[PDB]
Amino acid sequence: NLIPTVIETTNRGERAYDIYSRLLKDRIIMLGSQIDDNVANSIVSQLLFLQAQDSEKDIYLYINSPGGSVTAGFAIYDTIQHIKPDVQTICIGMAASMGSFLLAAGAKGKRFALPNAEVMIHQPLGGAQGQATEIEIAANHILKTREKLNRILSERTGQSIEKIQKDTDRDNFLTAEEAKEYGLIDEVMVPE
Amino acid sequence: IPTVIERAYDIYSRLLKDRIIMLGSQIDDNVANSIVSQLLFLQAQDSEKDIYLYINSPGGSVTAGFAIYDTIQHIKPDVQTICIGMAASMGSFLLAAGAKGKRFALPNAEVMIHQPLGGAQGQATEIEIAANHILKTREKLNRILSERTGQSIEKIQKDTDRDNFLTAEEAKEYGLIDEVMVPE
Amino acid sequence: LIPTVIETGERAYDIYSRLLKDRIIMLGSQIDDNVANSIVSQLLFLQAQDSEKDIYLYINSPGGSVTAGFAIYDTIQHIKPDVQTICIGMAASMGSFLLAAGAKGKRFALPNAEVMIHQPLGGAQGQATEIEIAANHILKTREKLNRILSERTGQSIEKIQKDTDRDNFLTAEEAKEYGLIDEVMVP
Amino acid sequence: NLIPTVIETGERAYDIYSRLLKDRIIMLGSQIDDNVANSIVSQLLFLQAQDSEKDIYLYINSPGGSVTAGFAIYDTIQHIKPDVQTICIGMAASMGSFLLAAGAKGKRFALPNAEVMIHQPLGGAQGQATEIEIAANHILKTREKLNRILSERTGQSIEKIQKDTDRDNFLTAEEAKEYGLIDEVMVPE
Amino acid sequence: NLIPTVIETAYDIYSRLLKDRIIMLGSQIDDNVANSIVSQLLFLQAQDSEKDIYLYINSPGGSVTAGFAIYDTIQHIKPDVQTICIGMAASMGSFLLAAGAKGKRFALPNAEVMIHQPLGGAQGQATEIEIAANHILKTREKLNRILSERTGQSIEKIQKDTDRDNFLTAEEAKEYGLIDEVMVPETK
Amino acid sequence: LIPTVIETTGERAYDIYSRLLKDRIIMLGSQIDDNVANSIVSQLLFLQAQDSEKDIYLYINSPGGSVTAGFAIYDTIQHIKPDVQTICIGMAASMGSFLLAAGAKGKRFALPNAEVMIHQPLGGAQGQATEIEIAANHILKTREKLNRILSERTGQSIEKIQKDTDRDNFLTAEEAKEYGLIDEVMVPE
Amino acid sequence: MNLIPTVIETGERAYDIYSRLLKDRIIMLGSQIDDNVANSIVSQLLFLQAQDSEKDIYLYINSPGGSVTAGFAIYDTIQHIKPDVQTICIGMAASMGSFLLAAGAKGKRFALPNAEVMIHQPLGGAQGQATEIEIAANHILKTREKLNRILSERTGQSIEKIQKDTDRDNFLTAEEAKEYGLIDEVMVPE
Amino acid sequence: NLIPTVIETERAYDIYSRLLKDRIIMLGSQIDDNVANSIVSQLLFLQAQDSEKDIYLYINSPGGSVTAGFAIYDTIQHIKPDVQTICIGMAASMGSFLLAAGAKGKRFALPNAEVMIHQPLGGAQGQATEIEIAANHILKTREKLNRILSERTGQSIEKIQKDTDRDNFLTAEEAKEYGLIDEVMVPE
Amino acid sequence: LIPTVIETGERAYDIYSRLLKDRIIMLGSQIDDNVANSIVSQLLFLQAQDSEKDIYLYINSPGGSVTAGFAIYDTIQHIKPDVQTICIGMAASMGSFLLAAGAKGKRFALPNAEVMIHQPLGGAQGQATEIEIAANHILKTREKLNRILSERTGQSIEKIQKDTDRDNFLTAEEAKEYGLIDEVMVPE
């Protein structure tokens, strides 16, 4: 479809801004889609840009995502942890799979979800075809990746790896209040 | 899409400048992303001045509607909902979401409401989880509509079992809107 | 398009059915549940007709389903009659496995017939739990395939594993040295 | 239309190919796959079981097919006690030309306007470099086997076969006789 | 048993006509059809080597090599093969119509005959295409050589006439030397 | 599913169409192509071989089809000794209506509610200007042949047939009688 | 116009986020490597050298690889140009992407703590005559030898070891990639 | 990340057009008429801008249309300015032909770039006459291609023919000895 | 992807607009109604800008719609400025026809450019009356094409018909001798 342009007067002329770009000026990043390499490349670039303009002031990341590539999510995750500013994460709609992972990845004390926003967690998925040697390698890799995913989730939520392992066997849906109890968020955002 | 100059503005961008957001498309994650951005943008400009949201939608993703819904309730400015054409499913839900006393539907606009849809395919354990998640989502959906309209949860449940087509006057009677817009 | 013969009352056999009367089974296609179903039926019928006399199985197969291949293998070993295996064209994958399954001293390949051996293939899609189960099943099936080949060729499992890692093409003489067959048929 | 039926007198009916099989005549008029090879081999074995002395006539009008399927047929021809006469009608190309040369020596025939084609085998290689290397050696080794057998059965040198089959090589009935592919260009009897 | 008789797809109508030494061609000439026609010619010779065979042609042609397989079996077999043209004998069909026994090639009053040069295809390298072009030219040379012998026309004339599509009536086809006579309705 | 009938001689099965062939009835219920024409011609030639004296009944319910395939049927009808009776049921159109007129004179019928359609032949030409000219000349000459024969069999002039077949002309049973395509309209016995 | 329109992602008439990073000499590789992607990256490297030959260039790689020749076009340019190219791995560097990660200025090749590095042998397709397949097999075998030779020089690993480790897919952590010699330092957040 | 943008502090450039300003033309596609048109216009544009200064053409091309390559080739040879050809990644088929087309002394390939030479491919479908014409054209076009290749490398036409029968892959050092390039580009 | 040229306010031009500013028109595609419209509009624009100064038309076209080419042809002749036609790569069919249609003494082809001439193609489907009308049109249009080509080249209509019966491929020198072009462009 179409996204609106916001035009505003500057010191040296009139700037036409993309609506997301306009929000970007106020240090707001909107993730509203599945996470692939192109989406991860965008988000990382926005994060690196926001640090370059100001390394002290906070960055707000809105997360409404069904997730996508794990590696693409890890590209985003590592960038969040590496940059100097605190990245505030706000869940609206649904933050699932990798989206739930990135929501819990925000600055501790600054991870929020909106009252009717949903959070879901589950174990990762993969594919494997060809020879038995090739399938074993792919099988060992997805199990090794899952161990890393559970371990980081244990650090973020405060829940044990064994609990994370048990609670992600099948899809698990949570409320904003149930997500706060789990340790995925800090506070449910209250109307202002 | 036509362009107007003052600064060259497209027609939707020109109306955004006067705090008007047009939602004529189907509600997906992309559309929900854009509406939330516009709502947050208009609050930053002025937190007191109202915003007008025209609704002409057959709905779409339930969670995507909730992203818009929770943003409407969260922000300081009052959001007015204006129904033109048809507000069905999640679009009707977003119409009821407008600031109380400021929800209108136009005389010949149609309002349709019904229960949510889903897909569950795979093992019996996986189907049960998908079945329980949709059933809990509907309860939440019914519970919110109860509060917006004043109708009982059990009534909302019974009425949304099948497709329910309501006129502008019928929608007002239901409490989905406050007034019917008078030609002036 | 396949010819019919009439043996003199008078009753009509198709060309393959006629050879089954002389206890000859033609496997000349990919091995699936259907083909395995047909081959097993022919093995059981021929045993019921006569328990003592030898059965001749011609193999020209790229292979196919492993379990379907095992349905044939187990029937071959179970029945009382000796099943001679003759390789013409190509016995690859499960075909080479079924070729080596014949009665010892009675496994043949023709002079220009080819034999291919390699590790099995699989497909796993879904959750990490689902993939672990699938990988464990495929790997364990390979162990089963390797130890049976060890028993029938005399080669060690370490050699079978090493030599089946990639596609391995063998001539009739090379297969005999390996122990997949006993003799190379001569004109 | 179709393939006609013949009745011999109770009453019995043959399809036209099945009637010819009675007189030890086999028709190969399609691409050579595993099914076609399977059918052809069985007919050779059935005819030998019926009589191991008398000659078999195999008509060849084939564009070729699988090399392994052709070798299944080839190896059966050499194995059986009866001589197999090869008759080329229309076109014998690739593996079809190879099988025409496979016929009993002194008994390979082609009709006056029948065409014979010889060329190197085709293949496919996909995936890893190690996987490609293995497939390349197999097609190369199989080509050497095909060229070696062709040299033995025509009288041309291996190096000449290699050079002549590098590209598509078209031969007339006389040219096939000169090449040693057939013994005689069958002329009207 | 008695074999069930049927019209199409069992004892079909063609099998019943085959008893009286009549071979019906009402389709494209490909390897399947060539193979079947050839088998019928060989079967009919085995039954009787003296009695004449009747081949009705209503074909638009097909594979050149398929035509030659039918063509050469016609020339080799001892019995006379009479060619009757009904509807249309085009391309390899018209070539096969001229192949019939001399004095015994007929076409019906409104039967059409078409003669034209052979078609082909070549894809790939310049060496690959050169070989394909050389093969198609040599095959065309062979086609005109044989037609010349059958028609009585010169090779040079055949080349000119079959350059483009050449539609001939039954009377025109007789004039050309493709057929011996036109089967007029007034014959008992 | 085409039902079959069994009769005693010994016991012989017939499909319904070949059972009707025993009483010299040929059914044309399909669009005329080279396969259909090949079947019809065979039935006409088989019936002559059985009996030269007795009439043949050809029911026609066809939209038409290939002109050359229609001419193969037409020419065979005129060549054989038996009179061919043409009965129209449902719709005889295009090439089928032409074949309806081809019946033995005084023995061409249409049933009370059967329709007849006549029109000029269709065609296709795609290529060079030389190639289109030849195809265009061929189609126009073929139309002359169709109109000349229609003029002879019906009784109308060539100029009237040319003008009436310019567009699609739909005729009833009574109109087809008056035009000359049939002789009588069948009545319930 | 006095000023250019600003957009994040994106005919194109605007100032996208990647261009703003390109002003600070940063190149974002976040896709599979084809000739189109290679062309743009090479153009960015050549442009950045022209602006300032002394200052460093930062190449972020999140790639599964692609064309070997397209990867080599990027590779040769990195080595040819005067400015140092720092390579940073985020998410995944696999195949030709891991090769380009090794290609960065020695002492300036980084990976993020949960970034993955994957190395394996090249892939190909060959369909046709036995003569034609032989050429394709020889060409892919020579290209693997070239790839292994360059990786040996870059990582400090022996050619023999590279051949063995790349026979099948080989998944490495950021620490394991550092020990291999593919990177220099794991960019730890602390 | 697409084809990014460069801002001159406003003036906006896409990355390739910015390099065009500094006389650098990027060819990294299959060569077809649209591509050929873009290259030619760029070459004529740069000639019109200045007639003395060199033009740099980077080649990462698998090949393309032969006539479209010649459109580019002939424009290069006609214009006053020297055009330097730089091979990055792969210069195959016509890409290798255009690589040899550069100003002598100024034809470079990077150390790990690949050069590939082979005979052209064609298509011929239809009548035997049409096939003969099409075969003649592509054989004559191949004669033209080898002739120009011979003139620009110093190799005999007989050698070029033999070397382009099948796909021939050459290294950057190997291309230099052949005469396809002058020097292997060395790091600074 | 076409590069942008910026000339100094400051103006943004795509590469084809910048060459259009210097009276150069690029034709490097199939000739259809859209292309022809764009080509014709450019010619009218350049006459409006300057009636006296010469226009340059680069042609790399395989052909297209005959009527669309005539819109270009008739506009070329009607306008006051001399239109120079330069064959780059390949001018085939209507592209060749338009090449010869340039101002006399001002029509060129580059040393390795190709020119191909042949008769027109058509499609006729439907009723016999409809086929006749379509066939007459193709035949009238061919005669119109041959006559104009005869006038331009100076060759007889009889020779035109004979040379365009099949595909005819001409070298740059052979195009000059034929009279399709006046001179072959020599490198500077």
Ligand SMILES: *C(=O)[C@@H](C(C)C)[C@@H](O)C(=O)N[C@H](C(=O)N[C@H](C(=O)O)[C@@H](C)CC)C(C)C
């Ligand atoms: C959540 O967003 C999951 C998707 C919605 C399915 C996501 O976490 C996920 O697991 N994605 C899978 C993935 O990226 N797998 C990769 C891979 O197979 O390459 C590795 C993590 C496997 C170890 C997608 C669906 C393949």
Ligand SMILES: *C(=O)[C@@H](C(C)C)[C@@H](O)C(=O)N[C@H](C(=O)N[C@H](C(=O)O)[C@@H](C)CC)C(C)C
């Ligand atoms: C109205 O717009 C509804 C339909 C489009 C008519 C909409 O509310 C709806 O039910 N959407 C469904 C949906 O979001 N389903 C999700 C899902 O399974 O992903 C369920 C979780 C909702 C309970 C779409 C049609 C799937």
Ligand SMILES: *C(=O)[C@@H](C(C)C)[C@@H](O)C(=O)N[C@H](C(=O)N[C@H](C(=O)O)[C@@H](C)CC)C(C)C
């Ligand atoms: C040889 O015939 C093998 C292939 C056809 C090349 C055959 O042995 C084989 O591996 N078949 C595979 C198979 O049956 N896989 C099953 C399966 O995943 O269902 C595995 C359990 C076997 C270990 C086919 C190709 C899937």
Ligand SMILES: *C(=O)[C@@H](C(C)C)[C@@H](O)C(=O)N[C@H](C(=O)N[C@H](C(=O)O)[C@@H](C)CC)C(C)C
């Ligand atoms: C002639 O008949 C050849 C082709 C049909 C034209 C035939 O000899 C041939 O090369 N067949 C190919 C073939 O069997 N290739 C096998 C294979 O791919 O397994 C190679 C092992 C042969 C060396 C078919 C067309 C693949």
Ligand SMILES: *C(=O)[C@@H](C(C)C)[C@@H](O)C(=O)N[C@H](C(=O)N[C@H](C(=O)O)[C@@H](C)CC)C(C)C
């Ligand atoms: C008439 O029957 C001709 C065609 C139906 C138009 C027939 O003679 C013909 O041209 N057949 C072509 C053919 O046999 N081509 C082969 C080939 O491509 O291999 C050439 C060898 C024939 C010289 C068919 C239409 C391809």
Ligand SMILES: *C(=O)[C@@H](C(C)C)[C@@H](O)C(=O)N[C@H](C(=O)N[C@H](C(=O)O)[C@@H](C)CC)C(C)C
């Ligand atoms: C009635 O059946 C007519 C068609 C169904 C429309 C039939 O008479 C007819 O015109 N058939 C066309 C035909 O055979 N055309 C051939 C041809 O193009 O080869 C012309 C030679 C006829 C003059 C069919 C539909 C092509």
Ligand SMILES: *C(=O)[C@@H](C(C)C)[C@@H](O)C(=O)N[C@H](C(=O)N[C@H](C(=O)O)[C@@H](C)CC)C(C)C
């Ligand atoms: C990693 O990026 C590899 C694949 C994309 C997974 C990459 O190294 C690779 O193998 N690329 C292959 C390639 O470039 N193959 C060419 C070719 O056959 O054209 C070979 C010449 C390389 C030696 C692609 C995937 C075909």
Ligand SMILES: *C(=O)[C@@H](C(C)C)[C@@H](O)C(=O)N[C@H](C(=O)N[C@H](C(=O)O)[C@@H](C)CC)C(C)C
């Ligand atoms: C290398 O670029 C070659 C191929 C793309 C691999 C290229 O030189 C080539 O052969 N191109 C072919 C071509 O342009 N053929 C023309 C044509 O068909 O008009 C012939 C006249 C060339 C003799 C393309 C691939 C068709």
Ligand SMILES: *C(=O)[C@@H](C(C)C)[C@@H](O)C(=O)N[C@H](C(=O)N[C@H](C(=O)O)[C@@H](C)CC)C(C)C
């Ligand atoms: C050259 O460019 C020719 C073709 C494009 C190869 C061109 O001259 C030509 O024949 N064009 C055909 C054309 O426009 N035909 C019209 C038509 O059928 O409408 C005829 C009236 C022309 C006499 C195209 C290919 C249809």
